[PDB]
Design a protein around this ligand. Structure first.
Ligand SMILES: [Ca+2]
Ligand SMILES: [Ca+2]
Ligand SMILES: [Ca+2]
Ligand SMILES: [Cl-]
Ligand SMILES: [Fe+3]
Ligand SMILES: [Fe+3]
Ligand SMILES: [Fe+3]
Ligand SMILES: [Fe+3]
Lengths: 197, 197
């Protein structure tokens, strides 16, 4: 398990930061939804792998942590007068999930590797953002950054628990390249994990 | 907020308790699954009603409480050597969901009333089981009673928040009738919410 910047294929582009700072409300609402989706994804993995007890125990606890984050973002939004509004999911997680192999057991390994990338990128991007944010939001985002690093390690360690070290290294190489492409490519919308607007 | 025996159309039949006691490992597995489905159903409502702030805040916290229950049952199965075996869902929750009207805003109100019945029945049924179980399981199930009553109250209170006292009384009367027949009808598989074997 390498360090975050080493694991990831590129830093967050300055142009993404610029767009994010100009629309922190869209950022916050999509961030709130992402925390919820992390919990919902963790539950879908429990349902899909109902006999993988190690997975089930980790995902149940992970889902609860992400639901806390979801509620914390909602409280921050309420404090700052950010109303709720429909914000469709971005392309990011769907693009990464297209690289998952369609057959067990490597389907599960690839799914967990994609999860490690989503959490690692979230940690890197929080870190890129906080020097530009106000004190309250930077403090909040700094706390979340630490949990993302833990979740990145947790996802990658679960993948090794179920996968061959050699196939994981090649899976990481494939998703790392596609992840970098999703992060550096032009994008039509601002999302927490969007490309360059 | 009526009392639980008053809210429900029927007590847990004695024949169901005798079946449950003769097959406590299946009961525990289905119970674990029911705690997970409660949290998963909670997250589904957040997804469907993603700008209803009151619903989203209550269901996030509810989902976390039910995942704690999910993990507790898992730890109890470990202590008692219950294998993680796939156990199909019962007919109960899906039977109740067929009564949900197809158009908003009464669609949401009906869904919340169904949630109230499921939690009220779980409370009634835990209470019926407790005096017959061993000490460890009896105390565990007794500690869940207070949570289920609270969840029954929460669902019903949420239905009143989004709906007219007229159509809620109308909905409660219809679901009560369908729920008691699900509980009193013959059933071909022991589940926590199954009918009579
Ligand atoms: Ca790098
Ligand atoms: Ca800017
Ligand atoms: Ca056994
Ligand atoms: Cl929790
Ligand atoms: Fe999180
Ligand atoms: Fe996370
Ligand atoms: Fe529960
Ligand atoms: Fe409950």
């Amino acid at each position: 398990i390498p360090e975050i910047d080493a694991f990831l294929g590129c830093p967050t582009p300055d142009a993404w930061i610029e767009a994010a700072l100009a629309d922190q409300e869209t950022l916050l609402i999509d961030h709130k939804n992402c925390e919820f989706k992390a919990a919902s994804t963790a539950l879908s993995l429990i349902a899909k792998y109902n006999t993988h007890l190690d997975l089930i125990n980790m995902m149940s606890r992970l889902a609860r942590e992400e639901l806390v984050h979801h509620e914390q973002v909602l409280r921050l939004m309420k404090r700052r007068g950010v109303p709720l509004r429909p914000v469709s999911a971005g392309r990011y997680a769907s693009g990464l999930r297209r690289l998952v192999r369609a057959h067990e057991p490597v389907k599960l390994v690839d799914t967990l590797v994609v999860g490690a990338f989503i959490e690692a990128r979230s940690c890197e991007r929080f870190a890129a953002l906080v020097p530009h944010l106000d004190e309250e939001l930077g403090r909040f985002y700094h706390g979340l950054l630490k949990s993302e690093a833990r979740h990145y390690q947790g996802y990658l360690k679960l993948a090794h628990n179920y996968g061959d070290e050699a196939d994981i290294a090649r899976r990481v190489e494939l998703v790392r390249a596609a992840e970098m492409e999703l992060i550096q490519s032009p994008d039509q919308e601002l999302r927490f994990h969007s490309g360059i607007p």
